Amino acid sequence: KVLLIGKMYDEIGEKLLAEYTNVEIIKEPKQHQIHEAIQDVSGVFVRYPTKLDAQAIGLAKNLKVISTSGFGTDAIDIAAATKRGIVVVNNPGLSTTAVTEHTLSMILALAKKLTFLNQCVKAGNYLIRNQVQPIQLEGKTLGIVGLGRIGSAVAKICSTALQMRVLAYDPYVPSGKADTVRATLVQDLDYLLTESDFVSLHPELTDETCEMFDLEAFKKMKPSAFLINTSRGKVVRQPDLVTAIREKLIAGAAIDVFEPEPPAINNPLYEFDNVIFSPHLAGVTPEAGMAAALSAANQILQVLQGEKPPYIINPKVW
Amino acid sequence: KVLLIGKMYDEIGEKLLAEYTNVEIIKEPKQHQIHEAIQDVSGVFVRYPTKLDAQAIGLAKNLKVISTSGFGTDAIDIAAATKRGIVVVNNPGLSTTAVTEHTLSMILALAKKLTFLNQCVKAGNYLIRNQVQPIQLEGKTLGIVGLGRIGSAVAKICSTALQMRVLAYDPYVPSGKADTVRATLVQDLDYLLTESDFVSLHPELTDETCEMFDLEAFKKMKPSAFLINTSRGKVVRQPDLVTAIREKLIAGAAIDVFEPEPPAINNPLYEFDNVIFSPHLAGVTPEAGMAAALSAANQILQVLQGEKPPYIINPKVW
Ligand SMILES: NC(=O)c1ccc[n+]([C@@H]2O[C@H](COP(=O)([O-])OP(=O)(O)OC[C@H]3O[C@@H](n4cnc5c(N)ncnc54)[C@H](OP(=O)(O)O)[C@@H]3O)[C@@H](O)[C@H]2O)c1
Ligand SMILES: NC(=O)c1ccc[n+]([C@@H]2O[C@H](COP(=O)([O-])OP(=O)(O)OC[C@H]3O[C@@H](n4cnc5c(N)ncnc54)[C@H](O)[C@@H]3O)[C@@H](O)[C@H]2O)c1
Ligand SMILES: NC(=O)c1ccc[n+]([C@@H]2O[C@H](COP(=O)([O-])OP(=O)(O)OC[C@H]3O[C@@H](n4cnc5c(N)ncnc54)[C@H](O)[C@@H]3O)[C@@H](O)[C@H]2O)c1
């Protein structure tokens, strides 16, 4: 028996679990409903941000595997599952391709001033073509902050396909990793800031990267340069971005993540024609949802068959 | 002596002509000004769309070479120059990279619904994220019509970097040209129409391609597919594109070129949130202007030194 605490991101994951297990789905999970349905199941799927505490894990007698819906596992009492022999697996990185494409879309849209030119045409101001000139990406410098799953994939596209010079700042990756995607790893972040025509943020949100892009960073950036953020809103100190755009410390920005989130209806960034937005959708494609559903459903079956899943969070239990 | 009827797009072409010839530049060219400055010069550069008619060509006693600023030569009386032994050259293909990047920008913008999502957020409708789902390009099929300079460069990027299956339709290109850019050349346009998730137009405008994309073509396209046109406005019958969008025969369109051009304030396409525009700027970058200026200046010098230029429009005079 397998319990789905919340629906999966795609129905393909629920059908696959139904092929091998008896699956019960709680659509709107309450804490008492979990207690009454977890006692005899062998696997548990947890939809973010529903919590799974020591009480529910204590009531789960036959539990062997707990799977979250994505990267986040903060809502799961990991300590309670390790003592009971339960392996816990998450499902990270399954929207790497979606965010990569979304990042490329925003870099290009800023270079071609797409939203502004589209609005000008729709208002009958086709003649804006005489004043405004797009930017050619070939030969420009892309600065990547965070050379992880997405950062590496974005680096690889822009360096080879778009023929950009790619700098990368990431102190926790092997020194040769930038060469695998034809980027140059730099040790000093200030160097990336003064050399880049486009800066794209893809770091993990840590205490070191939190508000890493503040006013001091924007001053070092080229006034003609653009900022792209598809990582986390807290990586950018948003008031400093508002100042950077208004005082023309940079030429524009593309933003998929916000702090605070959701953004308020009257966010001061909304008034600028050189700032473009998407409502935290960079990783949301049908394919990414299916991959997350399949990865979660399949790791449950691996544990129930004695096979080692690839994303164990508590390795000391295997 | 060389006369510049209008400024070149970049000063680099004017300096190169000044190294070998005596150059006069008429910045805002009037017809009588052309008459009074062309009588003794050996070469002429014509900035679009200024006309060079039989009266001016008749007054040009020492004329040997006429160069336009771009592809177009409609404003030049070619017949009057052919009789006088004057070679005419255009300057095509010097913005291949700009149009390629602009094409990619529009393909991505449609897939991510960028302008619509940007408008919703700025209008306080951040919650549109619950209604709208972006498209992932990886694994989709791109159909390229016209596998020339632009079509080939778009094919190569989309097939490898973006991991798309690329089909091409071009009956005048060697069968192996598609393989060099990892595309499949198909003989039946219907095959490309029914198989593509994105159709991007890059053909030369001929009587065969004029209004090639009419209502019959849009009916064969997938209701989920998108159209991108950066080639020429006459390749698409615009009323049929309006019908195709309104009746949802296709899912959206990105348009950089228009028929008629310029588009009017009340274009019926403006009302649709899934149609995006740019005001015929796909090829307009500083780099493209520099290359066009260099090519025009160099073809003038080639003729003045007896060397055959690569883009002669009237070859029967050589
Ligand atoms: N890189 C650049 O080319 C560049 C640089 C700076 C500025 N611009 C902007 O572009 C505008 C004109 O650029 P351009 O004239 O030098 O480029 P062009 O290639 O000569 O384009 C001239 C026009 O003629 C038509 N055309 C295209 N191919 C043609 C062909 N083989 N034969 C006949 N007509 C053809 C097109 O309009 P239709 O389809 O409607 O007939 C095109 O817009 C200027 O107003 C300027 O604002 C361009
Ligand atoms: N819908 C969306 O917008 C969306 C979707 C998925 C992921 N994300 C976010 O995108 C970002 C990248 O995702 P990922 O899968 O590539 O993560 P990842 O774990 O694969 O890589 C993150 C990188 O950050 C690097 N890093 C750590 N500290 C750094 C520092 N001080 N400076 C620079 N780099 C540092 C790490 O070395 C690591 O390589 C994450 O913040 C993730 O939450 C957003
Ligand atoms: N600012 C702009 O939007 C801009 C800039 C430059 C060029 N263009 C336009 O882009 C288009 C392509 O430019 P290019 O430099 O690659 O031209 P190109 O001459 O290199 O290639 C055009 C292709 O069209 C193909 N073709 C001819 N007839 C066809 C048919 N019936 N079906 C399918 N294909 C056919 C030809 O075989 C050729 O290969 C041209 O229409 C050009 O005028 C637009």
Short mmCIF file of all heavy atoms in Angstrom, two decimals, chain A residues 126 129-131 133, chain B residues 8-10 45-49 68-75 90-95 98 204-205 231-234 257-262 280-293 313, ligand 1:
data_model
loop_
_atom_site.label_atom_id
_atom_site.label_comp_id
_atom_site.label_asym_id
_atom_site.label_seq_id
_atom_site.Cartn_x
_atom_site.Cartn_y
_atom_site.Cartn_z
N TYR A 126 5.12 51.75 -34.62
CA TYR A 126 6.09 50.98 -35.38
C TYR A 126 7.37 51.78 -35.62
O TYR A 126 8.47 51.21 -35.64
CB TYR A 126 5.46 50.57 -36.71
CG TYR A 126 6.37 49.94 -37.75
CD1 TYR A 126 6.52 48.56 -37.84
CD2 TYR A 126 7.03 50.73 -38.68
CE1 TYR A 126 7.32 47.99 -38.80
CE2 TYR A 126 7.84 50.17 -39.65
CZ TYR A 126 7.98 48.80 -39.71
OH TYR A 126 8.79 48.24 -40.67
N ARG A 129 11.35 51.86 -34.41
CA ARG A 129 12.51 51.19 -34.99
C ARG A 129 13.63 52.15 -35.35
O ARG A 129 14.77 51.71 -35.52
CB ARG A 129 12.09 50.41 -36.24
CG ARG A 129 11.66 51.29 -37.40
CD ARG A 129 11.12 50.48 -38.55
NE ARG A 129 12.02 49.41 -38.95
CZ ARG A 129 13.02 49.54 -39.81
NH1 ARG A 129 13.27 50.71 -40.38
NH2 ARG A 129 13.78 48.50 -40.10
N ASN A 130 13.33 53.44 -35.51
CA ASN A 130 14.36 54.43 -35.82
C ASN A 130 15.17 54.87 -34.61
O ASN A 130 16.29 55.36 -34.77
CB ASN A 130 13.72 55.64 -36.50
CG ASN A 130 13.07 55.29 -37.84
OD1 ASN A 130 13.53 54.42 -38.56
ND2 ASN A 130 11.97 55.97 -38.15
N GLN A 131 14.63 54.73 -33.39
CA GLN A 131 15.33 55.13 -32.18
C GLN A 131 15.98 53.98 -31.42
O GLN A 131 17.08 54.13 -30.89
CB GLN A 131 14.39 55.89 -31.24
CG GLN A 131 13.85 57.18 -31.82
CD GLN A 131 14.94 58.23 -31.97
OE1 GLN A 131 15.43 58.48 -33.07
NE2 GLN A 131 15.33 58.85 -30.86
N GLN A 133 17.56 50.14 -30.84
CA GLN A 133 18.38 49.16 -31.56
C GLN A 133 18.64 47.94 -30.68
O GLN A 133 19.17 48.08 -29.56
CB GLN A 133 19.70 49.81 -31.99
CG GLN A 133 20.53 48.99 -32.95
CD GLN A 133 21.59 49.82 -33.65
OE1 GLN A 133 21.98 49.53 -34.78
NE2 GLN A 133 22.06 50.87 -32.98
N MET B 8 26.47 55.74 -44.58
CA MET B 8 26.47 54.31 -44.36
C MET B 8 25.98 54.02 -42.94
O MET B 8 25.88 54.92 -42.10
CB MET B 8 27.86 53.71 -44.57
CG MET B 8 28.50 54.11 -45.88
SD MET B 8 29.97 53.14 -46.28
CE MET B 8 29.20 51.74 -47.06
N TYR B 9 25.67 52.75 -42.67
CA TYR B 9 25.15 52.38 -41.36
C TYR B 9 26.20 52.45 -40.27
O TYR B 9 25.85 52.48 -39.09
CB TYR B 9 24.57 50.96 -41.42
CG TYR B 9 23.31 50.90 -42.25
CD1 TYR B 9 23.06 49.81 -43.08
CD2 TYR B 9 22.39 51.94 -42.23
CE1 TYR B 9 21.92 49.76 -43.85
CE2 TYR B 9 21.25 51.89 -42.99
CZ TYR B 9 21.02 50.80 -43.80
OH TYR B 9 19.88 50.76 -44.56
N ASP B 10 27.48 52.48 -40.64
CA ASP B 10 28.57 52.62 -39.69
C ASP B 10 29.72 53.35 -40.36
O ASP B 10 29.94 53.20 -41.57
CB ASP B 10 29.06 51.26 -39.17
CG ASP B 10 29.98 51.40 -37.97
OD1 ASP B 10 29.48 51.43 -36.83
OD2 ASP B 10 31.20 51.51 -38.17
N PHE B 45 27.39 54.92 -53.59
CA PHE B 45 26.69 54.18 -52.55
C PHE B 45 25.33 54.83 -52.34
O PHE B 45 25.23 56.06 -52.27
CB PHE B 45 27.50 54.19 -51.25
CG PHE B 45 26.74 53.69 -50.04
CD1 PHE B 45 26.68 52.34 -49.77
CD2 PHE B 45 26.10 54.58 -49.19
CE1 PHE B 45 25.98 51.87 -48.65
CE2 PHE B 45 25.40 54.12 -48.08
CZ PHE B 45 25.35 52.76 -47.81
N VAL B 46 24.28 54.02 -52.28
CA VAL B 46 22.91 54.52 -52.14
C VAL B 46 22.31 53.95 -50.87
O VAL B 46 22.14 52.73 -50.74
CB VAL B 46 22.04 54.17 -53.36
CG1 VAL B 46 20.68 54.85 -53.25
CG2 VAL B 46 22.73 54.61 -54.65
N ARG B 47 21.98 54.83 -49.93
CA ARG B 47 21.32 54.41 -48.69
C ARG B 47 19.83 54.27 -48.93
O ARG B 47 19.17 55.22 -49.38
CB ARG B 47 21.59 55.40 -47.56
CG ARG B 47 21.13 54.93 -46.19
CD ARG B 47 21.17 56.08 -45.19
NE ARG B 47 21.66 55.67 -43.88
CZ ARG B 47 20.89 55.40 -42.84
NH1 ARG B 47 19.57 55.50 -42.94
NH2 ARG B 47 21.43 55.04 -41.69
N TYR B 48 19.29 53.10 -48.62
CA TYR B 48 17.87 52.84 -48.79
C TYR B 48 17.06 53.82 -47.96
O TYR B 48 17.48 54.19 -46.85
CB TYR B 48 17.57 51.40 -48.37
CG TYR B 48 16.14 50.94 -48.51
CD1 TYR B 48 15.70 50.32 -49.68
CD2 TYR B 48 15.23 51.08 -47.47
CE1 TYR B 48 14.39 49.89 -49.81
CE2 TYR B 48 13.92 50.65 -47.59
CZ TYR B 48 13.51 50.06 -48.76
OH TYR B 48 12.20 49.63 -48.88
N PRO B 49 15.91 54.31 -48.47
CA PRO B 49 15.33 53.94 -49.77
C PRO B 49 15.50 55.00 -50.85
O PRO B 49 14.65 55.08 -51.74
CB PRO B 49 13.85 53.78 -49.43
CG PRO B 49 13.62 54.77 -48.27
CD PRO B 49 14.99 55.19 -47.73
N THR B 68 24.10 49.34 -53.26
CA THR B 68 23.03 49.65 -52.32
C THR B 68 23.51 49.39 -50.90
O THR B 68 24.61 48.89 -50.67
CB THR B 68 21.78 48.83 -52.63
OG1 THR B 68 22.09 47.43 -52.48
CG2 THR B 68 21.31 49.10 -54.04
N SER B 69 22.67 49.73 -49.93
CA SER B 69 23.02 49.49 -48.54
C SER B 69 22.63 48.10 -48.05
O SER B 69 23.22 47.63 -47.07
CB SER B 69 22.39 50.58 -47.65
OG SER B 69 21.00 50.73 -47.91
N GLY B 70 21.69 47.42 -48.70
CA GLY B 70 21.23 46.11 -48.25
C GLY B 70 20.85 45.18 -49.40
O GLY B 70 21.48 45.20 -50.46
N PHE B 71 19.83 44.35 -49.16
CA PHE B 71 19.34 43.44 -50.20
C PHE B 71 18.67 44.21 -51.32
O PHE B 71 18.85 43.89 -52.50
CB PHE B 71 18.33 42.44 -49.63
CG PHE B 71 18.89 41.40 -48.69
CD1 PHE B 71 19.46 41.77 -47.47
CD2 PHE B 71 18.78 40.05 -48.99
CE1 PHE B 71 19.95 40.81 -46.60
CE2 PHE B 71 19.27 39.09 -48.12
CZ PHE B 71 19.85 39.47 -46.92
N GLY B 72 17.87 45.21 -50.96
CA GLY B 72 16.96 45.83 -51.90
C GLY B 72 17.66 46.69 -52.93
O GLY B 72 18.57 47.46 -52.62
N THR B 73 17.23 46.54 -54.19
CA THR B 73 17.70 47.38 -55.29
C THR B 73 16.53 47.94 -56.10
O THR B 73 16.73 48.41 -57.22
CB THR B 73 18.63 46.59 -56.21
OG1 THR B 73 17.93 45.48 -56.77
CG2 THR B 73 19.85 46.08 -55.45
N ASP B 74 15.31 47.92 -55.54
CA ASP B 74 14.15 48.37 -56.30
C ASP B 74 14.22 49.86 -56.62
O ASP B 74 13.67 50.30 -57.64
CB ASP B 74 12.86 48.06 -55.52
CG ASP B 74 12.47 46.60 -55.61
OD1 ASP B 74 13.08 45.85 -56.40
OD2 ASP B 74 11.54 46.19 -54.88
N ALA B 75 14.88 50.65 -55.78
CA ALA B 75 14.97 52.09 -56.00
C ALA B 75 16.03 52.46 -57.03
O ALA B 75 16.17 53.65 -57.34
CB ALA B 75 15.25 52.81 -54.68
N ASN B 90 24.35 44.55 -54.64
CA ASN B 90 23.66 44.71 -53.39
C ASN B 90 24.54 44.12 -52.29
O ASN B 90 25.66 43.66 -52.54
CB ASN B 90 22.26 44.08 -53.45
CG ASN B 90 22.29 42.57 -53.49
OD1 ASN B 90 23.31 41.96 -53.85
ND2 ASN B 90 21.17 41.96 -53.13
N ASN B 91 24.04 44.13 -51.06
CA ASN B 91 24.79 43.65 -49.91
C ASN B 91 23.86 42.77 -49.08
O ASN B 91 23.28 43.21 -48.08
CB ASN B 91 25.38 44.81 -49.11
CG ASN B 91 26.46 45.54 -49.88
OD1 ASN B 91 27.63 45.15 -49.85
ND2 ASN B 91 26.08 46.58 -50.61
N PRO B 92 23.69 41.51 -49.50
CA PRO B 92 22.81 40.60 -48.75
C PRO B 92 23.60 39.74 -47.79
O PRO B 92 24.82 39.59 -47.94
CB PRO B 92 22.19 39.76 -49.87
CG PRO B 92 23.31 39.65 -50.88
CD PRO B 92 24.14 40.92 -50.77
N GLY B 93 22.92 39.15 -46.82
CA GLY B 93 23.52 38.16 -45.94
C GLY B 93 24.41 38.70 -44.85
O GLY B 93 25.09 37.90 -44.18
N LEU B 94 24.46 40.01 -44.64
CA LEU B 94 25.36 40.58 -43.64
C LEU B 94 24.73 40.70 -42.25
O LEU B 94 25.40 41.15 -41.32
CB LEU B 94 25.84 41.95 -44.13
CG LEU B 94 26.58 41.70 -45.46
CD1 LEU B 94 26.46 42.88 -46.38
CD2 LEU B 94 28.05 41.33 -45.22
N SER B 95 23.48 40.28 -42.08
CA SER B 95 22.84 40.27 -40.77
C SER B 95 22.37 38.87 -40.38
O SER B 95 21.40 38.73 -39.62
CB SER B 95 21.69 41.27 -40.74
OG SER B 95 20.77 40.98 -41.77
N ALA B 98 22.22 38.31 -36.60
CA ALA B 98 21.18 39.10 -35.94
C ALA B 98 19.81 38.47 -36.13
O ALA B 98 19.03 38.34 -35.17
CB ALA B 98 21.17 40.54 -36.46
N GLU B 204 13.44 33.08 -49.42
CA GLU B 204 13.44 34.26 -50.29
C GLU B 204 12.03 34.50 -50.81
O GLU B 204 11.29 33.56 -51.08
CB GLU B 204 14.41 34.05 -51.45
CG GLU B 204 14.54 35.23 -52.40
CD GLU B 204 15.37 34.90 -53.63
OE1 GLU B 204 15.73 33.71 -53.81
OE2 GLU B 204 15.66 35.83 -54.42
N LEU B 205 11.66 35.77 -50.94
CA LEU B 205 10.35 36.11 -51.49
C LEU B 205 10.39 35.95 -53.00
O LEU B 205 11.08 36.70 -53.70
CB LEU B 205 9.94 37.53 -51.11
CG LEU B 205 8.64 37.98 -51.79
CD1 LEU B 205 7.47 37.08 -51.37
CD2 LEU B 205 8.34 39.46 -51.52
N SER B 231 11.00 36.68 -42.34
CA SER B 231 11.50 36.73 -43.71
C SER B 231 10.96 37.96 -44.43
O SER B 231 11.58 39.03 -44.36
CB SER B 231 11.14 35.45 -44.49
OG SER B 231 9.73 35.27 -44.59
N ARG B 232 9.81 37.83 -45.09
CA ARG B 232 9.17 38.96 -45.75
C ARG B 232 7.67 38.88 -45.47
O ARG B 232 7.10 37.79 -45.36
CB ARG B 232 9.42 38.94 -47.27
CG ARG B 232 10.90 38.97 -47.69
CD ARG B 232 11.53 40.35 -47.62
NE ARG B 232 11.00 41.26 -48.63
CZ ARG B 232 11.35 41.26 -49.92
NH1 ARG B 232 12.25 40.39 -50.37
NH2 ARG B 232 10.80 42.14 -50.76
N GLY B 233 7.03 40.05 -45.36
CA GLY B 233 5.61 40.07 -45.03
C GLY B 233 4.74 39.36 -46.06
O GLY B 233 3.75 38.72 -45.71
N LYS B 234 5.12 39.44 -47.34
CA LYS B 234 4.31 38.85 -48.40
C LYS B 234 4.33 37.33 -48.42
O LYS B 234 3.53 36.73 -49.15
CB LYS B 234 4.76 39.38 -49.77
CG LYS B 234 4.23 40.77 -50.11
CD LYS B 234 4.80 41.24 -51.44
CE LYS B 234 4.16 42.53 -51.91
NZ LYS B 234 2.86 42.25 -52.61
N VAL B 257 7.87 41.03 -39.72
CA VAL B 257 7.67 41.63 -41.03
C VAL B 257 6.19 41.60 -41.36
O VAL B 257 5.44 40.72 -40.92
CB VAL B 257 8.50 40.91 -42.11
CG1 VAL B 257 9.98 41.14 -41.86
CG2 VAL B 257 8.17 39.41 -42.12
N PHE B 258 5.75 42.59 -42.15
CA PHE B 258 4.33 42.88 -42.32
C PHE B 258 3.99 43.08 -43.79
O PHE B 258 4.83 43.47 -44.60
CB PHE B 258 3.94 44.13 -41.53
CG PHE B 258 4.31 44.06 -40.08
CD1 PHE B 258 5.61 44.33 -39.66
CD2 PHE B 258 3.35 43.73 -39.13
CE1 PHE B 258 5.95 44.26 -38.32
CE2 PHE B 258 3.68 43.67 -37.79
CZ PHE B 258 4.99 43.93 -37.38
N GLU B 259 2.73 42.79 -44.13
CA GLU B 259 2.13 43.16 -45.40
C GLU B 259 0.67 43.51 -45.16
O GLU B 259 -0.11 42.64 -44.77
CB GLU B 259 2.25 42.04 -46.44
CG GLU B 259 1.41 42.26 -47.71
CD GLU B 259 1.89 43.45 -48.56
OE1 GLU B 259 3.01 43.95 -48.32
OE2 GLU B 259 1.15 43.87 -49.47
N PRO B 260 0.27 44.78 -45.35
CA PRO B 260 1.17 45.85 -45.79
C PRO B 260 2.08 46.35 -44.68
O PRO B 260 1.81 46.12 -43.51
CB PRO B 260 0.20 46.95 -46.24
CG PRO B 260 -1.01 46.74 -45.39
CD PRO B 260 -1.12 45.25 -45.18
N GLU B 261 3.14 47.06 -45.07
CA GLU B 261 4.13 47.56 -44.14
C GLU B 261 4.27 49.05 -44.38
O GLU B 261 4.33 49.48 -45.55
CB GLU B 261 5.48 46.84 -44.32
CG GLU B 261 6.37 46.86 -43.08
CD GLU B 261 7.63 46.01 -43.25
OE1 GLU B 261 7.56 44.78 -43.01
OE2 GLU B 261 8.68 46.56 -43.63
N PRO B 262 4.29 49.89 -43.33
CA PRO B 262 4.19 49.57 -41.91
C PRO B 262 2.79 49.16 -41.47
O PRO B 262 1.82 49.56 -42.10
CB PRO B 262 4.59 50.88 -41.23
CG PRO B 262 4.09 51.92 -42.18
CD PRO B 262 4.35 51.34 -43.56
N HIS B 280 10.17 45.15 -37.64
CA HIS B 280 11.14 44.87 -38.70
C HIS B 280 12.55 45.28 -38.28
O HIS B 280 13.22 46.08 -38.93
CB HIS B 280 10.72 45.53 -40.02
CG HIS B 280 11.34 44.89 -41.22
ND1 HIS B 280 10.70 44.85 -42.45
CD2 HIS B 280 12.53 44.28 -41.40
CE1 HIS B 280 11.47 44.22 -43.32
NE2 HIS B 280 12.59 43.87 -42.70
N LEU B 281 12.99 44.70 -37.16
CA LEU B 281 14.30 44.97 -36.58
C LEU B 281 15.15 43.71 -36.44
O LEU B 281 16.21 43.77 -35.80
CB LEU B 281 14.17 45.63 -35.20
CG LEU B 281 13.89 47.13 -35.10
CD1 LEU B 281 13.82 47.55 -33.64
CD2 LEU B 281 14.95 47.92 -35.84
N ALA B 282 14.73 42.58 -37.02
CA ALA B 282 15.43 41.32 -36.76
C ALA B 282 16.90 41.42 -37.16
O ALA B 282 17.77 40.86 -36.49
CB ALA B 282 14.76 40.17 -37.51
N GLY B 283 17.19 42.12 -38.25
CA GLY B 283 18.55 42.24 -38.73
C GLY B 283 19.28 43.50 -38.33
O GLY B 283 20.37 43.75 -38.84
N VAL B 284 18.73 44.29 -37.40
CA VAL B 284 19.30 45.60 -37.12
C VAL B 284 20.05 45.56 -35.79
O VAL B 284 19.48 45.82 -34.73
CB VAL B 284 18.20 46.68 -37.10
CG1 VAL B 284 18.82 48.05 -36.85
CG2 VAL B 284 17.41 46.67 -38.40
N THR B 285 21.34 45.26 -35.85
CA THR B 285 22.26 45.35 -34.73
C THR B 285 23.45 46.18 -35.17
O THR B 285 23.71 46.30 -36.37
CB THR B 285 22.75 43.97 -34.25
OG1 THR B 285 23.50 43.34 -35.30
CG2 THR B 285 21.57 43.08 -33.85
N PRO B 286 24.20 46.76 -34.22
CA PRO B 286 25.42 47.49 -34.61
C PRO B 286 26.38 46.67 -35.44
O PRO B 286 26.97 47.19 -36.39
CB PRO B 286 26.04 47.88 -33.25
CG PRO B 286 24.88 47.95 -32.32
CD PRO B 286 23.94 46.86 -32.77
N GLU B 287 26.53 45.37 -35.11
CA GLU B 287 27.45 44.52 -35.87
C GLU B 287 26.97 44.33 -37.31
O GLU B 287 27.79 44.35 -38.24
CB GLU B 287 27.58 43.14 -35.19
CG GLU B 287 28.39 43.10 -33.89
CD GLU B 287 27.65 43.68 -32.70
OE1 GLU B 287 26.44 43.99 -32.83
OE2 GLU B 287 28.26 43.80 -31.61
N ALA B 288 25.66 44.14 -37.50
CA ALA B 288 25.14 43.97 -38.85
C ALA B 288 25.37 45.22 -39.69
O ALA B 288 25.76 45.13 -40.86
CB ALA B 288 23.65 43.63 -38.81
N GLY B 289 25.16 46.40 -39.09
CA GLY B 289 25.41 47.63 -39.81
C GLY B 289 26.86 47.77 -40.22
O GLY B 289 27.16 48.16 -41.35
N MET B 290 27.78 47.41 -39.32
CA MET B 290 29.21 47.46 -39.65
C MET B 290 29.53 46.54 -40.81
O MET B 290 30.24 46.93 -41.75
CB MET B 290 30.03 47.08 -38.42
CG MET B 290 29.89 48.04 -37.25
SD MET B 290 30.75 47.47 -35.77
CE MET B 290 32.42 47.33 -36.40
N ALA B 291 29.02 45.30 -40.78
CA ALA B 291 29.30 44.36 -41.86
C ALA B 291 28.73 44.85 -43.19
O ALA B 291 29.39 44.77 -44.23
CB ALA B 291 28.75 42.98 -41.51
N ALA B 292 27.51 45.40 -43.16
CA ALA B 292 26.92 45.92 -44.39
C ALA B 292 27.74 47.08 -44.93
O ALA B 292 28.01 47.15 -46.14
CB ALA B 292 25.47 46.35 -44.14
N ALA B 293 28.18 47.98 -44.05
CA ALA B 293 29.00 49.10 -44.48
C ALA B 293 30.32 48.63 -45.08
O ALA B 293 30.77 49.14 -46.11
CB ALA B 293 29.24 50.05 -43.30
N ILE B 313 24.45 42.44 -59.38
CA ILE B 313 23.06 42.22 -59.72
C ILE B 313 22.84 42.12 -61.24
O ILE B 313 21.97 41.37 -61.69
CB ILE B 313 22.20 43.34 -59.09
CG1 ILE B 313 21.63 42.86 -57.75
CG2 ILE B 313 21.11 43.81 -60.05
CD1 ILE B 313 20.17 43.21 -57.53
N1 LIG C 1 21.74 45.71 -40.68
C1 LIG C 1 20.86 46.55 -41.46
O1 LIG C 1 20.48 46.20 -42.53
C2 LIG C 1 20.40 47.90 -40.90
C3 LIG C 1 21.27 48.71 -40.23
C4 LIG C 1 20.83 49.89 -39.73
C5 LIG C 1 19.51 50.28 -39.91
N2 LIG C 1 18.66 49.48 -40.58
C6 LIG C 1 17.28 49.86 -40.77
O2 LIG C 1 16.77 49.15 -41.89
C7 LIG C 1 16.18 49.94 -42.76
C8 LIG C 1 16.63 49.58 -44.20
O3 LIG C 1 17.75 48.72 -44.19
P1 LIG C 1 18.37 48.26 -45.65
O4 LIG C 1 17.52 48.88 -46.74
O5 LIG C 1 19.79 48.73 -45.81
O6 LIG C 1 18.28 46.63 -45.84
P2 LIG C 1 17.59 45.95 -47.17
O7 LIG C 1 18.01 44.50 -47.25
O8 LIG C 1 18.01 46.68 -48.42
O9 LIG C 1 15.94 46.04 -47.03
C9 LIG C 1 15.27 46.93 -47.88
C10 LIG C 1 13.76 46.58 -47.94
O10 LIG C 1 13.47 46.11 -49.12
C11 LIG C 1 12.77 44.87 -49.01
N3 LIG C 1 13.64 43.77 -49.35
C12 LIG C 1 14.26 42.80 -48.66
N4 LIG C 1 14.94 42.04 -49.53
C13 LIG C 1 14.75 42.55 -50.76
C14 LIG C 1 15.21 42.16 -52.00
N5 LIG C 1 16.08 41.04 -52.29
N6 LIG C 1 14.87 42.84 -53.08
C15 LIG C 1 14.05 43.92 -52.96
N7 LIG C 1 13.59 44.31 -51.75
C16 LIG C 1 13.94 43.61 -50.65
C17 LIG C 1 12.35 44.74 -47.78
O11 LIG C 1 11.04 45.44 -47.60
P3 LIG C 1 9.66 44.73 -48.18
O12 LIG C 1 9.65 43.28 -47.79
O13 LIG C 1 8.46 45.42 -47.59
O14 LIG C 1 9.63 44.84 -49.69
C18 LIG C 1 13.42 45.45 -46.96
O15 LIG C 1 12.89 45.94 -45.81
C19 LIG C 1 16.56 51.41 -42.44
O16 LIG C 1 15.45 52.20 -42.45
C20 LIG C 1 17.16 51.36 -41.03
O17 LIG C 1 16.24 51.99 -40.04
C21 LIG C 1 19.09 48.29 -41.07
#
